Amino acid sequence: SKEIDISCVKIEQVIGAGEFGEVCSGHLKLPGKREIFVAIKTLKSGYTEKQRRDFLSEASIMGQFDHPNVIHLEGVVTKSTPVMIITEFMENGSLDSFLRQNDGQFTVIQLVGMLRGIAAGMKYLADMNYVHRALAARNILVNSNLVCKVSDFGPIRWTAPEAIQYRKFTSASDVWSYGIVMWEVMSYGERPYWDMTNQDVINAIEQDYRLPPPMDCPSALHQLMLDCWQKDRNHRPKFGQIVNTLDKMIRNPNSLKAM
Ligand SMILES: Nc1ncnc2c1ncn2[C@@H]1O[C@H](COP(=O)(O)OP(=O)(O)O)[C@@H](O)[C@H]1O
Ligand SMILES: [Mg+2]
């Protein structure tokens, strides 16, 4: 969205590597507004016109959104070099790697909290008529308070049967993906279907196989997963319902006691 003048940006250091260039952290001080810490995606020089457009497309997409569970876009730098995409800063980075570094360090209530935010963000996106198509733990960022937000607006084992076979992507297929994500979270970053091959995964799902309950996962959360993994997309829950279901679990914590 908004075009930012390089004079307002002061890069601090490298915090990650994107496919289009380095990812940094830094300060943003717009005229009048108060300085803030941000994340800065840069484009490697010598880029092709296609690379430039694809890179900036990500900003155009997320720029059209605005929700606490969707990565906030501060703006972009295109008039001068390097080209940049400034966004919200998420100290804990990617959710999957984040969970791997904290194996079994959270309560069911915390995990459910993370899943609720992701659900709220997807509910928002669905209402805005946006189909992510690539929902997965690696595409969700987490901050200090553990708030998870959907990212990557620029994967067999994560995709619904129909989407894989007929390339039919809908919010419904995102619900299936959300199911896999729920598994990833309760598994603390474990890879879905483990070392199974992508083809094995396809044949397994065909044979009505479904990922088992992750360790210490309440039977109520695994059932919600199954619902998300229903062969018939029309039967899968809506993100709105997924949210309410999660909310009900928060009301009466004893509903998560049945292991
Ligand atoms: N807003 C952000 N705050 C903190 N770290 C970030 C942020 N965006 C990206 N990163 C870090 O940079 C890495 C690469 O960025 P990512 O957006 O996942 O790449 P791409 O979407 O280009 O494939 C992430 O795995 C994460 O650790
Ligand atoms: Mg990524």
Question: Is 84 exposed, middle or buried (CB count within 10 Å of its CB: 0-12, 13-18, 19+)?
Answer: buried
Cis amide prior to 82 (ω within 30 degrees): yes
* Cβ of residue 177 lying under 6 Å from some atom of ligand 1: no
Residues just before a chain gap in the chain (C–N exceeding 2.5 Å) are 154
* Cβ of residue 85 lying under 6 Å from some atom of ligand 1: no
Q: Is 130 left (phi over 0), alpha (psi -120 to 50) or beta?
A: beta
Helix (H, G, I), strand (E, B) or coil at 128: coil
CA of 142 to the centre of ligand 2 (A): 13
Q: What length does the chain have?
A: 259
DSSP conformational letter for 6: G
CA of 139 to the centre of ligand 2 (A): 5
Ligand positioned closest to the Cα atom of 135: 2
Amino acid (one-letter) located at 204: A
Q: What's the CA angle centered on 92, arms 130 and 57, to 5 degrees?
A: 35
DSSP conformational letter for 222: H
* Cβ of residue 54 lying under 6 Å from some atom of ligand 1: no
Question: Is 227 exposed, middle or buried (CB count within 10 Å of its CB: 0-12, 13-18, 19+)?
Answer: middle
Question: Is 33 exposed, middle or buried (CB count within 10 Å of its CB: 0-12, 13-18, 19+)?
Answer: exposed
- Least Cα distance to 255 among 104, 112, 148, 115 occurs for 112
* Cβ of residue 15 lying under 6 Å from some atom of ligand 1: yes
> Which atom of ligand 1 is the closest one to the Cα of 19?
22
* Cβ of residue 94 lying under 6 Å from some atom of ligand 1: yes
* Whole-number Å distance between alpha carbons of 215 and 113: 18
Helix (H, G, I), strand (E, B) or coil at 214: coil
* Cβ of residue 90 lying under 6 Å from some atom of ligand 1: yes
Protein residue closest via CA to atom 5 of ligand 1: 93
Question: Is 184 exposed, middle or buried (CB count within 10 Å of its CB: 0-12, 13-18, 19+)?
Answer: buried
Helix axes 108-127, 239-251, angle to 10 degrees: 150
- Substitution candidate for ligand 1 out of 13, 23, 61 with most atoms within 8 A of CB: 23
* Whole-number Å distance between alpha carbons of 129 and 126: 5
- Give span(s): CATH 3.30.200.20, the chain: 1-89
Tokens of 68: 């606490």
The Cβ of residue 168 has, within 10 Å, a number of other Cβ atoms equal to 13
> Alpha helices of the chain — where are they, by DSSP H?
49-63, 95-100, 108-127, 161-165, 171-186, 198-206, 219-228, 239-251
Is the domain spanning 90-256 CATH 3.40.630.30? The answer is: no
* Whole-number Å distance between alpha carbons of 170 and 254: 34
Protein residue closest via CA to atom 12 of ligand 1: 16
- Give span(s): CATH 1.10.510.10, the chain: 90-256
Q: Which residue has the tokens 């619900």?
A: 175
CATH annotation of 1-89: 3.30.200.20
Protein residue closest via CA to atom 27 of ligand 1: 93
